[PDB]
Amino acid sequence: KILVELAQQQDREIGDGTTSVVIIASELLKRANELVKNKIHPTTIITGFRVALREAIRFINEVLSTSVDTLGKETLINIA
Amino acid sequence: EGVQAFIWQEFASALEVIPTTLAENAGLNSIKVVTELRSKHENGELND
Amino acid sequence: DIRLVKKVGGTIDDTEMIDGVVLTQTAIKSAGGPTRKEKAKIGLIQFQ
């Protein structure tokens, strides 16, 4: 039920993604199950995601392509 | 001494489960921590 | 005396202390917009 409530808060901040983006929350638990079933406690696994998510915003900023130097409405048309 | 001798030693060692529980969730050996503390409390001197 | 107000949306990092009284409810907002009012007195009406 927590994953269902994600679409409520996502539509407030973003406004879309229920047809596409919301799927990303599914597979996050797929590979997180195989790790907790052997040795490593979920704390080290989650803190490993915290240190990765902290730098993941900067990793996106490296591949980030700003919107500028485009002819006409091609940007707004492609986003549409 | 007296009858309270061994009783107070068990009550003093009853609090040893608090650092032992913290070592289980952190992936640390219980004796490895306790063996050091016996040396630490005679060396580390409290605040360590 | 410490008041806690809940608001849906945003992040916990943006949570900060407010310099004025915050209420959960508000006006019906049917056909008035008093809104931002400079130099206004805050009264309390118990009677209906």
C-alpha to C-alpha distance for B16 and B30, rounded to whole angstroms = 10
* N- to C-terminal Cα separation, chain A: 31
C-alpha to C-alpha distance for B47 and C17, rounded to whole angstroms = 34
List Cβ neighbours of C22 (8 Å cut-off, separation of 6 or more). Answer: C3, C5
Please check whether residue C32 touches A, CB under 8 A.
no
Last residue before each break in chain B (C–N > 2.5 Å) = none
C-alpha to C-alpha distance for A44 and A42, rounded to whole angstroms = 6
The pair of structure tokens assigned to B41 is: 């409390």
List Cβ neighbours of A32 (8 Å cut-off, separation of 6 or more). Answer: A42, A45
3-state secondary structure labels for all residues of chain C: CCCCCCCCCCCCCCCCCCCCCCCCCCCCCCCCCCCCCCCCCCCCCCCC
Q: How many CA atoms lie within 13 A of B46 on its CB side?
A: 1
Helix-then-strand count for chain A, H and E: 5, 0
Comparing alpha-carbon positions, the chain C residue that sits nearest to A10 is C9
Which residue in B22, C35, A67 sits closest to B34, CA to CA?
Answer: B22
**Resolution of the experimental structure, in angstroms:** 5.6
CB A6 within 8 A of CB A22: yes
A13 CB neighbours in chain C (<8 A) are 9
Please check whether residue A41 touches B, CB under 8 A.
yes
